[PDB]
Design a protein around this ligand. Structure first.
Ligand SMILES: Nc1ncnc2c1ncn2[C@H]1C[C@H](O)[C@@H](COP(=O)(O)O)O1
Lengths: 103, 104
């Protein structure tokens, strides 16, 4: 009901964590659990490649259909673009429904 | 080789997009009168016209077909597809037909 594709077997969950690295243990055995860990984090790269199937417009409609277009008028910032401070921004939500079909 | 009671062609107006190329067809109905009583006549600018507007020529009984305008071959929607999705287009080959002639 928010939108999209209901799936019984959706793309799986990818889980990740940093393996614990203990700090120096005591020199006499104690069965208590370690609260002492080396503070660390990890970084890396992630790629996602999805293959989307398309359904083409077959319409016989004579007159021009609405399309999603960028405003021609000048502006301080360009839409869907970084600003002077490097911050990416999306000015408006874009739905997918423009082309028209008959019932 | 048909005769009076057999149509010599069919009506094809459609456009089809192959995605490398587009093939646009236009079928129309026309009427040809009899121009200037079957006569070749010379025509020339009337004296008193400005120097720049003088001309001399010939008018013929013949008519002619010209599709040279774009919208002949493209509907406004087919035109929208082209100009929106494409950096360039050029014509490759054309095919022309006259059929279902009637003389009244
Ligand atoms: N989002 C979504 N996910 C899964 N199943 C759905 C969904 N929406 C509707 N349905 C069900 C009920 C439809 O009549 C049928 C169409 O399946 P068809 O493939 O068109 O034959 O599938």
């Amino acid at each position: 009901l928010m939108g999209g594709f209901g799936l019984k077997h959706p793309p799986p969950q990818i889980m990740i964590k940093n393996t614990p690295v203990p700090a120096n243990p005591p020199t006499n055995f104690s069965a208590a659990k370690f609260a002492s860990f080396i503070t660390q984090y990890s970084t890396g790269q992630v790629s996602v490649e999805i293959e989307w199937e398309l359904q083409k417009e077959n319409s016989k409609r004579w007159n021009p259909e609405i399309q999603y277009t960028s405003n021609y008028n000048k502006s301080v910032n360009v839409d869907f673009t970084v600003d002077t401070n490097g911050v990416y921004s999306e000015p408006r939500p874009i739905g997918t429904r423009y082309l028209t079909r008959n019932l | 080789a048909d005769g009076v009671g057999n149509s010599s062609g069919n009506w094809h107006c459609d456009s089809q997009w192959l995605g490398d190329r587009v093939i646009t067809t236009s079928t129309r109905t026309w009427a040809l009168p009899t121009y200037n009583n079957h006569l070749y006549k010379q025509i020339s600018s009337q004296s008193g016209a400005t120097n720049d507007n003088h001309y001399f020529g010939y008018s013929t009984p013949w008519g002619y077909f010209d599709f040279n305008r774009f919208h002949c071959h493209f509907s406004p929607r087919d035109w929208q597809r082209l100009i929106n999705n494409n950096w360039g287009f050029r014509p490759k080959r054309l095919n022309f037909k006259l059929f279902n002639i009637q003389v009244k």
